[PDB]
């Protein structure tokens, strides 16, 4: 049997970090962030929010192999804007949007009568 | 059949010619019949070609038969591969078969 344990999809293993930022030598002011134990759920959401930023230049993500739960995020920004700061802003925007969504759903649900 | 022969102008133009296809082979006798072009008569059985024209003629006929079979299905194989097999089959002065009574009767070591 060679089936990997299912908890390896989300549980961080020994000697492994959630994020791994390295500089992209091909283009200036570009970095590559490797997310461990994550999948398209966050890659698509994070990438889409980044593309809404005017100062962000290039935003793309890819899962090299479905076997391993890890995806790479490439962020390039305008000169003087840190790609890490761009990731900070995008994540904050997602959280704020999600927080409003949770409040809106609860208020609407309270008005319903059938359930 | 249609054969491309140079035109008097200099270009290649196809014109029809009358050809006789026969069942059964008598190469030596048919070649002498008047009215035919003896320099173009061809025989399906390269055995008759070998014993009437020569080993080199049989080699060319043998390659032609092998080429037709491979090209009959549409597959294409480089010329050198066919030539090497034909040359091996005619390197001893005759048509040696690829069975145990042909190449396996040579002097190439008992172990081989």
């Amino acid at each position: 049997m060679n089936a990997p344990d299912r908890f390896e999809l989300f549980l961080l293993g020994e000697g492994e970090s959630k994020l791994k930022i390295d500089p992209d030598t091909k283009a200036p002011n570009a970095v590559v962030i490797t997310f461990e134990k994550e999948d398209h759920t966050l890659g698509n959401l994070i990438r889409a929010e980044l593309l809404n930023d005017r100062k962000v230049l290039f935003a793309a993500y890819k899962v090299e192999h479905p076997f391993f739960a890890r995806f790479k995020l490439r962020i390039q920004t305008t000169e003087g804007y840190d790609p890490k700061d761009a990731l900070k802003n995008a994540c904050n925007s997602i959280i704020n949007k999600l927080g409003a969504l949770k409040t809106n759903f609860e208020t609407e649900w309270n008005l319903q009568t059938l359930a | 059949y249609d054969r491309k022969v140079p035109s008097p102008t200099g270009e290649y133009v196809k014109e029809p010619e009358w050809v006789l296809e026969t069942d059964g082979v008598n190469l030596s006798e048919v070649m002498t019949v008047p009215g035919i072009d003896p320099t173009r008569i061809y025989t399906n059985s390269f055995i008759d070609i070998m014993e009437v024209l020569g080993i080199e003629a049989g080699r060319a006929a043998l390659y032609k038969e092998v080429y037709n079979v491979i090209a009959s299905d549409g597959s294409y194989v480089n010329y050198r591969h066919m030539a090497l097999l034909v040359d091996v089959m005619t390197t001893q002065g005759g048509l040696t078969s690829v069975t145990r009574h042909g190449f396996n009767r040579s002097n190439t070591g008992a172990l081989m």
Binding site: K26, A27, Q76 | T9, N78, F103
Partner: protein, 559 residues
Amino acid sequence: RGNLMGKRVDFSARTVISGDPNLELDQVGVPKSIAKTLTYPEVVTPYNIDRLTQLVRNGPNEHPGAKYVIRDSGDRIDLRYSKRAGDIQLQYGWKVERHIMDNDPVLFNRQPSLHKMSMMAHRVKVIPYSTFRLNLSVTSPYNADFDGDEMNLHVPQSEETRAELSQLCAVPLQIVSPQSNKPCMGIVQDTLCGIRKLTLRDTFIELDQVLNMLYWVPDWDGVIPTPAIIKPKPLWSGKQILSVAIPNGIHLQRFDEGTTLLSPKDNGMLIIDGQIIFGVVEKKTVGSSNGGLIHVVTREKGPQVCAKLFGNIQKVVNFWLLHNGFSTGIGDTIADGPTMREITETIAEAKKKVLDVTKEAQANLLTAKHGMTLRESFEDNVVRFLNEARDKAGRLAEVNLKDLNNVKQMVMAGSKGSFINIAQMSACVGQQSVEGKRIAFGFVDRTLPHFSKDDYSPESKGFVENSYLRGLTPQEFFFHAMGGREGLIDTAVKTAETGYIQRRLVKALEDIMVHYDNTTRNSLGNVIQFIYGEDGMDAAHIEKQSLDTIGGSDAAFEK
């Protein structure tokens, strides 16, 4: 034959093969369990003293690890049962048998292994699960599919063979086979189907998808190409993105039927500096065809660059097709009413024509064709008329098929299917023949106990007027089954006959080799050819070219 010419060997593994679109052409996925069992003896050197020592600490129960340590005296220590004495101190000149790691060169084979490309060297890639994994593009040289096929793996055990395997048997070096001086690998199946759709003029891509597709090409310089359409909305064409995967400096020009510089049907091909100008990329360009992109790239930039092309095209095309999708259903085999009416009358007219010849033959007024009997001549006329009816009906159905027809799309791209498949699936299965002849009278003067004696109508002798969509009648079903049984019997017998022929040919020419004097000689030294191929060139470096002097008229020659 069973113990000297061929024998069972160690350091080998077998398991089912599966397709991995995310694996490189020269990479092979190896199950973790197989990697642990297989080992490679590595000589301890100052360069690898640290790495090898760590593996011994890991032991044989944790990949990467080791299983044995061999001293300079020949003594071999099994790491199991050896931990009782604590750690072992390695020394230069020792050998550590450690689990095969990534990038290790191994030999990958599939039987019957009828040609050399059936045995090629891959780079190990340890992966989870119980199956092997290899690129789709390499299936064709192996003649392998993923319906349950098992393939062998062999691990070299010395540096001499380790370097030999990677420098002579590596997959990138086998792209251009010498059998037919044309590439043996190409884009196929899903990837081939997607590339045809992607390169259509109507295929445009927005910014969000373009960035992801660009990033999927590993060797991307990081420069976003200018969109073909700048206003009123930035759009990228499929040709533009596919051009990123093509290495710069590649030129390819092809002219199809009616093709011109302003290709109206978008046929042909024109690539300048790696940029696709016009033409739909299909089997004629990215397939294993002479003079195609693969043939040009490998001969111009090198085998390694060509190998990268396979992955880049596959990755970009696979990603695009994942988010576009392609399917096929029953609706793709259905032709509109007007087409079916035309198909029905085409068969009816052919049946009437077959009747017309039959009546005159019964009247004895039919004169046999020269060199043929009355019945054989009559059969030839009927067979030709019915075959043309199927072809004419098939053309009517095929022409009616729209560009959105999934079955038609695959045929146009060359991925799968053909004209005959569409005709039988939609228009008419056609005549069934056994031993190259119509259905014979197994009974007394009839084919089945349902017709009358001495019946020569197309239905009686096995003409399937229906299609697979419409179904076959019980009489047609049996006759169609009879034709199939002929193929199954032929396939089984032909496989045995061809295998013996292949063995005989190899044994007859096994001792022939090209020597340093360019002569071709056997073991005895007897000269077969004074120069190989009568020219002295290698088939892998031969291309079809036109001699401009032989052809043309005299006036054109002077001009």
